[PDB]
Design a protein around this nucleic acid. Structure first.
Ligand SMILES: O=c1ccn([C@H]2C[C@H](O)[C@@H](COP(=O)(O)NP(=O)(O)OP(=O)(O)O)O2)c(=O)[nH]1
Ligand SMILES: [Cl-]
Ligand SMILES: [Cl-]
Ligand SMILES: [Cl-]
Ligand SMILES: [Cl-]
Ligand SMILES: [Mg+2]
Ligand SMILES: [Mg+2]
Ligand SMILES: [Mg+2]
Ligand code: NA
Length: 334
DNA sequence: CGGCAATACG
DNA sequence: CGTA
DNA sequence: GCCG
């Protein structure tokens, strides 16, 4: 089993679901406490189990697996012997974990804000709603639409939203393309949002696109919220983090939609980064830097010795530049 | 210990 | 601070 | 928390 997640296929569904889920609780809790190193290790150990070809049924099978030390192995030992891990269960039940999970899952709220609120004594969504003047516009939107944003996004929602975005993008710029990215590109059946990457075959024509797209969506009454970021080789892409009004039979629900626009020259890097998973990209970038001495981000791949950027016409190019066997998106579910 | 992905945007 |  |  190789050490980096980008060196091994990791499918969406696998043979150690229970064990990985327990380790991911501990990762999540580590994050709430500001222990980013511990979070990373628990995430990696969970991912190692996702990549295994069959179920772990005995402690000996952890021998030699990367990222399994005393702590992670104990967790798996307890699950194997008793069906539960007391540490995991204590985390689950704790007021601190449940409140941080509640707060951090609000759009516009991160660990530091959730922690401050917790320390201030706040515990519920209604507690936050009673102090509106303190909230950012993004947080106000996240709270306003919290129930809907907590509802899993389904493939049928994706299909509908893709048609809407394709229509608006096609109205805003002839020849522009829309590519589904994020978790649904990796084969996920449900998600927290829908992510789309937009480009145009003639380099430069994609500039100045999202205000036109957003105007056209607003004119259809589809936009409940959005936050636009202008673009800057480009080292920042134009982006819009949106909440769409999605029609449902006799009603509607709010859905988070992210739009990002890249020049076609950088499209493969953007697609790679935005397709994830988050752990897959952290691992891939770590591998690039530490093993190959190349610096990878959403915009490109830089050789610091030669001081040159790699051109890429595909994700396959990028894996080749890094000396990695190609993994399709469905196997990037680290 | 030194590291842990990435980073301009607002 | 928070965003992908 | 794990790695080197
Ligand atoms: O911290 C991050 C967040 C996201 N990303 C990349 C990978 C992720 O798959 C992609 C889309 O971000 P989302 O927050 O939309 N996650 P994803 O689409 O994978 O799952 P979901 O939207 O269902 O939570 O952006 C990172 O690289 N680092
Ligand atoms: Cl830590
Ligand atoms: Cl899924
Ligand atoms: Cl981006
Ligand atoms: Cl590609
Ligand atoms: Mg997503
Ligand atoms: Mg997203
Ligand atoms: Mg230390
Ligand atoms: Na959040």
């Amino acid at each position: 089993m190789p050490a980096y997640a980008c060196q091994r296929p990791t499918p969406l569904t696998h043979h150690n679901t229970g064990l990985s889920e327990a380790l991911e609780i501990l990762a999540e809790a580590a994050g709430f406490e500001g222990s980013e190193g511990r979070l990373l290790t628990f995430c990696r150990a969970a991912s190692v189990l996702k990549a295994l070809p069959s179920p772990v049924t005995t402690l000996s099978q952890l021998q030699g697996l990367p990222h399994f030390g005393e702590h992670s192995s104990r967790v798996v030992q307890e699950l194997l012997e008793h069906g539960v891990c007391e540490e995991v269960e204590r985390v689950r039940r704790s007021e601190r974990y449940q409140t941080m999970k509640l707060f951090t899952q609000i759009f516009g709220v991160g660990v530091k804000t959730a922690d401050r609120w917790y320390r201030e004594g706040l515990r519920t969504l209604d507690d936050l709603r009673e102090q509106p003047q303190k909230l950012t516009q993004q947080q106000k939107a996240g709270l306003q639409h919290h129930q809907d944003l907590s509802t899993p996004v389904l493939r049928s929602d994706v299909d509908a939203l893709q048609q809407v975005v394709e229509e608006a993008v096609g109205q805003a710029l002839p020849g522009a393309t829309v590519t589904l990215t994020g978790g649904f590109r990796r084969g996920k059946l449900q998600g927290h949002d829908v992510d789309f990457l937009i480009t145009h075959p003639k380099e430069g024509q994609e500039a100045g696109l999202l205000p036109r797209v957003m105007c056209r969506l607003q004119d259809q009454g589809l936009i409940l919220y959005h936050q636009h970021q202008h673009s800057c080789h480009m080292d920042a892409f134009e982006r819009s983090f949106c909440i769409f009004r999605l029609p449902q039979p006799g009603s509607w629900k709010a859905v988070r939609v992210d739009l990002v626009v890249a020049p076609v020259s950088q499209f493969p890097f953007a697609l790679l980064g935005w397709t994830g998973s988050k752990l897959f990209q952290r691992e891939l970038r770590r591998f690039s830097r530490k093993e190959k001495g190349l610096w990878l981000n959403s915009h490109g791949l830089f050789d610091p010795e030669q001081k040159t950027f790699f051109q890429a016409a595909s994700e396959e190019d990028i894996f080749r530049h890094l000396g990695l066997e190609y993994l399709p998106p469905e196997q990037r579910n680290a």
